[PDB]
Amino acid sequence: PIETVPVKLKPGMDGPKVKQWPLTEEKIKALVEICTEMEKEGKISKIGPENPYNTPVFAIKKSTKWRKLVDFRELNKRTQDFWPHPAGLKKKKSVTVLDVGDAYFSVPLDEDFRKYTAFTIPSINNETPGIRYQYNVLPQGWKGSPAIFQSSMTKILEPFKKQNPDIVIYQYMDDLYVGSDLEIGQHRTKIEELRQHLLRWGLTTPYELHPDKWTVQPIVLPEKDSWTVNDIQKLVGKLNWASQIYPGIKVRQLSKLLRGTKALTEVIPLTEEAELELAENREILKEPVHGVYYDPSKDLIAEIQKQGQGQWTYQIYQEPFKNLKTGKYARMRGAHTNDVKQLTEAVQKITTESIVIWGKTPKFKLPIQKETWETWWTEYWQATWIPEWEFVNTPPLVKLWYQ
Amino acid sequence: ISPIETVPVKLKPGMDGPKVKQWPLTEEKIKALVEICTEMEKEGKISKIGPENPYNTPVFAIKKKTKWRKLVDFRELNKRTQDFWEVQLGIPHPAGLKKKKSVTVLDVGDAYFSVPLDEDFRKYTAFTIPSINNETPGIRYQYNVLPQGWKGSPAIFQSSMTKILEPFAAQNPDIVIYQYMDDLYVGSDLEIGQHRTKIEELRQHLLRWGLTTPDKKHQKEPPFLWMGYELHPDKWTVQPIVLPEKDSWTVNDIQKLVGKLNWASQIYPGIKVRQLSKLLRGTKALTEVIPLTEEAELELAENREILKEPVHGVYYDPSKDLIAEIQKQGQGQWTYQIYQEPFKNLKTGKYARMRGAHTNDVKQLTEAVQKITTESIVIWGKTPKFKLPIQKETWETWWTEYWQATWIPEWEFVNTPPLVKLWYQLEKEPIVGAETFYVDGAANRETKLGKAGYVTNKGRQKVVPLTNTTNQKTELQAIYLALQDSGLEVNIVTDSQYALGIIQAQPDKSESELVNQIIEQLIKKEKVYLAWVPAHKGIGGNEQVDKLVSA
Numbered sequence: 001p002i003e004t005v006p007v008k009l010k011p012g013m014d015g016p017k018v019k020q021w022p023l024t025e026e027k028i029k030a031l032v033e034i035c036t037e038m039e040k041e042g043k044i045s046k047i048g049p050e051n052p053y054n055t056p057v058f059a060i061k062k063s064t065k066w067r068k069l070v071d072f073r074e075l076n077k078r079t080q081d082f083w084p085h086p087a088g089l090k091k092k093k094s095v096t097v098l099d100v101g102d103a104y105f106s107v108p109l110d111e112d113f114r115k116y117t118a119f120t121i122p123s124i125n126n127e128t129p130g131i132r133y134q135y136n137v138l139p140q141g142w143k144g145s146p147a148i149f150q151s152s153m154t155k156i157l158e159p160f161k162k163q164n165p166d167i168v169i170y171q172y173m174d175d176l177y178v179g180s181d182l183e184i185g186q187h188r189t190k191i192e193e194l195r196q197h198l199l200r201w202g203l204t205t206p207y208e209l210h211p212d213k214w215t216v217q218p219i220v221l222p223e224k225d226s227w228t229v230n231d232i233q234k235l236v237g238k239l240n241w242a243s244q245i246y247p248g249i250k251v252r253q254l255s256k257l258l259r260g261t262k263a264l265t266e267v268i269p270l271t272e273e274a275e276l277e278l279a280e281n282r283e284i285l286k287e288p289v290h291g292v293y294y295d296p297s298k299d300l301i302a303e304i305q306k307q308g309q310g311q312w313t314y315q316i317y318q319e320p321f322k323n324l325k326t327g328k329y330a331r332m333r334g335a336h337t338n339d340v341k342q343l344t345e346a347v348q349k350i351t352t353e354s355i356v357i358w359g360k361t362p363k364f365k366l367p368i369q370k371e372t373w374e375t376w377w378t379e380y381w382q383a384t385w386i387p388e389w390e391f392v393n394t395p396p397l398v399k400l401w402y403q
Numbered sequence: 404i405s406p407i408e409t410v411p412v413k414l415k416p417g418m419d420g421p422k423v424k425q426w427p428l429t430e431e432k433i434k435a436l437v438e439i440c441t442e443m444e445k446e447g448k449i450s451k452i453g454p455e456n457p458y459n460t461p462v463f464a465i466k467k468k469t470k471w472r473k474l475v476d477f478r479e480l481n482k483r484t485q486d487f488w489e490v491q492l493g494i495p496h497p498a499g500l501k502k503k504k505s506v507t508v509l510d511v512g513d514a515y516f517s518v519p520l521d522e523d524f525r526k527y528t529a530f531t532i533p534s535i536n537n538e539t540p541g542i543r544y545q546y547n548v549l550p551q552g553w554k555g556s557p558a559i560f561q562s563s564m565t566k567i568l569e570p571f572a573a574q575n576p577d578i579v580i581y582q583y584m585d586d587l588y589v590g591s592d593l594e595i596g597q598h599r600t601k602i603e604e605l606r607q608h609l610l611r612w613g614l615t616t617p618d619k620k621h622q623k624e625p626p627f628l629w630m631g632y633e634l635h636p637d638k639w640t641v642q643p644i645v646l647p648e649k650d651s652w653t654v655n656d657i658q659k660l661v662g663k664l665n666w667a668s669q670i671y672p673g674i675k676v677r678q679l680s681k682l683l684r685g686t687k688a689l690t691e692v693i694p695l696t697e698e699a700e701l702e703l704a705e706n707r708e709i710l711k712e713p714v715h716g717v718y719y720d721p722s723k724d725l726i727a728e729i730q731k732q733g734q735g736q737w738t739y740q741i742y743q744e745p746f747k748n749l750k751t752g753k754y755a756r757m758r759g760a761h762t763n764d765v766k767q768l769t770e771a772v773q774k775i776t777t778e779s780i781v782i783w784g785k786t787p788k789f790k791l792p793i794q795k796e797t798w799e800t801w802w803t804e805y806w807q808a809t810w811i812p813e814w815e816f817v818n819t820p821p822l823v824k825l826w827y828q829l830e831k832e833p834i835v836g837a838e839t840f841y842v843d844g845a846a847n848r849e850t851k852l853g854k855a856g857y858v859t860n861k862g863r864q865k866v867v868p869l870t871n872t873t874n875q876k877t878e879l880q881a882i883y884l885a886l887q888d889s890g891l892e893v894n895i896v897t898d899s900q901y902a903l904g905i906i907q908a909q910p911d912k913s914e915s916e917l918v919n920q921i922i923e924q925l926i927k928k929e930k931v932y933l934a935w936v937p938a939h940k941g942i943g944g945n946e947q948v949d950k951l952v953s954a
C-alpha cells in the first residue's frame with residue numbers, strides 16, 4: 001500500500017476552516033484517550049501552526065466505549081469527485097447495514113492532502129491551545145476513503161458476489177448495505193457468511209431494514225358518528241389542502257351543509273350527497289400521485305413535524321407539493337425519552353431511507369432551536385455520517401393535515 | 404542560537420515577496436536605527452545581506468513621550484504570507500479558574516526575538532536603513548528571528564513556547580502553567596518557599612532555551628489588572644465601569660455605552676441594555692445624534708444605580724455542584740446567577756432577546772436556560788443544576804403543546820415571585836353556548852384604507868373603518884374587534900393563516916401594540932376558541948363577513 005492515491009481539491013478552493021465546538025470535560029477526556037491511542041498507532045500526527053485548516057470532532061457512544069466522530073461535511077464539499085446506486089436495493093425484503101470503516105485505516109493518505117484533515121481537541125474555558133492533529137491514513141467520514149478503497153473492496157467482495165448473484169451490495173461511505181429476498185434466517189446466515197469472509201481477509205466489522213414495507217402514506221380523513229360545524233370546517237379545510245395534490249377532490253356538497261351563519265358546536269347531519277362526496281374523496285386519496293419523479297441533479301429536502309405523543313411526521317421532496325416520500329415515526333415513551341432523542345432518531349431513520357432509495361442524504365429542515373440541536377444532537381447520534389440541516393422558525397399550520 | 408526548531412513558512416501561492424520602497428527619514432531616526440540594528444546584529448536577531456535581495460519593507464524609528472523603538476511596517480508581507488492556525492482569540496473567563504494557594508506571573512522579555520525564523524523565509528523580511536540624503540546606498544538587513552508585527556509571529560511563538568514547556572511540565576505535574584501572548588501564569592498548592600523554588604527552576608529552564616523572565620522578584624503582584632479584570636487572591640471582579648454623562652448621544656456613544664454595560668453584566672446582577680440597543684436599531688452613521696427614549700433614560704438610570712455598589716465574583720471548585728438561577732427582569736428581560744455557594748456567585752448574566760416579533764415568558768425562559776447551558780459548557784465543561792421560578796405544570800403544558808422540539812434539564816421549582824406562568828390558554832375544542840364570531844378584514848393595497856368586521860350566529864354584524872393599514876393588520880384588527888364585542892366565552896372563525904399563526908403561538912408580549920391589546924383581551928377572557936377556514940370557499944359565516952367587508 002506504499003503507493004498513495006493523489007487526491008486534489010476542486011479548482012479554486014482551499015481547505016476547510018470550521019470552528020471546533022465546545023465540549024464537556026467527559027467528551028474532551030474521551031477524545032484525548034482515543035487520539036493518544038490513534039497517535040501511537042501512526043494513524044494521526046501532531047501538527048504545527050503552519051496548518052490553518054480545521055474540521056470539527058465529537059465524541060459519541062454508538063457500546064459503553066467512547067467513539068470519535070469527525071464532521072467532514074465541509075472537506076467533503078471541497079474534495080474532488082472520484083471516477084453508482086442500484087435501484088433494486090429498495091425492492092429487497094431485507095437489507096442489513098454493516099460498518100466497514102475500520103478497513104480505511106489500512107491505506108495511507110496522500111502526503112500532500114493530509115494537512116486538510118486537520119482537527120482540534122478543544123480545551124475547557126480556552127485555558128490551553130487545543131491539541132491539533134492531522135490524519136496519516138484514510139479517515140472515516142471522508143468521501144475519498146470509500147473511493148480510494150473501492151478497488152480493494154471490490155477485490156474482497158468478488159468471491160461472495162460470485163457465490164450469491166441475487167444479493168445486492170451497495171456501499172455508502174463507511175456502510176455496506178446487503179439486501180436479499182431470502183427468509184430472515186437465511187438472510188442473517190448470508191450476512192454472517194459475508195461478515196466472516198470479510199474478517200478472514202483482515203476487514204474488521206465490529207441494524208437490518210425492510211424496505212419492502214416502505215410506502216408513501218395516504219391522506220386519511222376522519223370517521224365520526226356525529227359531525228359538528230367545526231368538524232365539517234376542519235374536513236373542508238383538509239380536503240381543500242389535499243386538492244392541491246389530488247385534482248378530483250370536491251367540497252361543494254360538504255360546504256353546502258354549513259350554508260348560513262351557524263354556531264360552531266351545532267350538530268350537522270351528513271346528507272346523502274355530502275356522504276357520497278366524502279366517500280368518493282376517500283376513494284380518490286387511495287391512489288398515488290401522477291407526475292412526481294426524482295431528479296438526481298437537485299437537492300433532497302426533508303421536513304419534520306412534531307405531532308405529540310411521540311409521533312413525528314416527515315416528507316421528502318425536491319420541489320414543493322411534489323413529495324417523493326412521506327412517513328410517520330413513533331417511539332414508545334418509557335419515561336426515558338424526550339423531544340431531542342426522538343427527533344435525532346427520526347433524522348437518522350429518514351437519512352437511512354434516503355440512502356437506500358436515492359443513494360444520498362437529504363437536507364433537513366429541523367423544527368428546533370439552532371443552539372439546542374447543536375448542544376444535544378450528539379447524545380443520541382449513532383450513525384457515522386452527518387447530513388446537512390437548517391432550522392425552521394415558523395410553526396407548521398399543516399401539522400394537523402399531515403397528522 | 405537555534406536550539407528551537409523553526410516552523411516552515413510559505414508565501415501565498417502565486418505571490419512574491421514585498422518590494423515596498425523605504426520612506427526617507429530624518430538623520431536622528433537614521434542614527435537610532437543604526438545603533439539599534441548594530442545591537443540586534445550582535446545578538447544574532449538580524450543579519451546584513453548582499454545586494455541581490457530584491458525585497459524591502461519600510462522601517463521607522465519613534466519614541467512615545469526615555470528609549471528609542473524601531474517599528475517595521477509588514478502590511479504588504481503580511482498580505483503575502485500564508486494563513487496560520489488562529490492564535491487564541493477567546494480569553495479564559497476568571498470564573499472558570501480554580502483557586503490556587505500560590506500564583507506567579509512571568510513576563511517573557513523580547514519574546515518574538517528569541518524564536519528563530521524559517522531560513523528560506525528570512526529573505527522576505529529584508530529592510531533598508533536609508534543613508535543621509537541618499538549619498539551612498541543604505542544598509543540592507545534581514546531578520547533571523549520572529550519580527551514584531553509579522554503575521555506569523557504570535558502563532559509560531561506560542562507553538563515554540565508550548566514545545567519548550569512540555570518537558571518541564573512533564574517533570575512537574577503538580578504545577579499549572581498557562582500561556583497567553585508573551586505571559587506565563589504559574590500556579591500551585593505547594594508551600595510558598597518550594598513554590599518559589601519551582602518558579603526559579605522554570606526560569607532557569609526557559610533561560611536555557613533563551614527566554615528571559617522577571618530577573619528580580621516578579622514585578623507583578625496581586626491584584627492583577629488584566630483584560631478589564633481585577634484578579635485578587637480570593638476573588639475576581641471587573642475593573643471600574645465609568646458611564647459617561649452627555650446631553651447629546653451619537654451612535655458611537657451608545658455603542659460604547661452598551662459595550663460597557665455588557666461588560667459589567669458578567670458580575671453585576673440586574674443590568675439591562677434592551678432599550679439602548681433599541682436606540683441602536685437604526686444602524687446609521689456613527690456620528691448621527693440619536694435622541695434618548697424615556698425607557699432608555701430609565702434603563703440607564705437603573706444601571707447607574709446598580710453600578711454604584713461594588714461586586715466581586717469567586718473562583719471555581721470542581722468538587723462542588725454548579726448551580727444557576729434565573730429571575731425575570733421585566734418586559735422580555737432576564738437575569739441569572741451562576742454559583743456553587745449560596746451567596747458567592749461565580750458570575751452573572753442577562754438575556755433579553757425576542758428573536759421574533761412575538762413571544763411568551765416560557766419560551767424566553769427556555770432560551771435563557773439554553774444560553775446558560777452553552778456558557779457553562781464553555782467555561783466549566785459541564786451543565787449546571789437549575790433553580791427556576793416556574794412550576795412543572797406550566798412548563799410541561801408548554802413544552803408538550805409546543806410545536807418545536809425542546810430540551811428541558813433537571814430543575815427544582817423555587818417559589819420567588821414573579822413566577823413564570825401561562826397568562827392564558829386557548830381552547831382546544833369549540834365552546835358550547837358561546838357566540839360564534841365570523842371575522843374578516845380587508846385593505847386597499849394602494850390607498851392603505853381598510854375595514855374590519857364580524858358577523859355572528861346571533862345575527863350581530865359590525866364594520867369598523869381603518870386608515871393606513873394592510874390586510875394582515877386588518878385580520879388582526881378583526882380578531883380584536885370580535886374580542887371587544889363578545890362575552891367571556893367566544894368562538895372565533897377567521898380565514899387568515901397569518902393571524903391564526905400569531906394567535907396560536909399564544910404570546911404574552913409583542914412589538915406591535917395591536918397584538919398587545921389582543922393579548923390583554925385574551926387575558927381578560929375565560930374561554931376562547933379560534934378556528935380557521937379556507938377563504939373564498941363559500942363555507943358559511945365566513946362568506947357573509949367576506950361580502951360584508953368587501954362592500
Ligand SMILES: C=CC(=O)Nc1cc(Oc2ccccc2OCCn2ccc(=O)[nH]c2=O)c(C)c2cc(C#N)ccc12
Nearest residue numbers: 495496497500501502503506579588589590627629635636
Ligand atoms: C482568565 C484567565 C486568568 O485570569 N488567568 C490568570 C491566572 C493566574 O494565576 C493562575 C495560574 C495558574 C492556575 C490558576 C491561576 O489563578 C487561579 C485564581 N487566582 C488568581 C489570582 C490570584 O492571586 N490567585 C488565584 O488563586 C494569573 C496570576 C494571571 C495573571 C494575569 C496578569 N497580569 C492575567 C491572567 C492570569
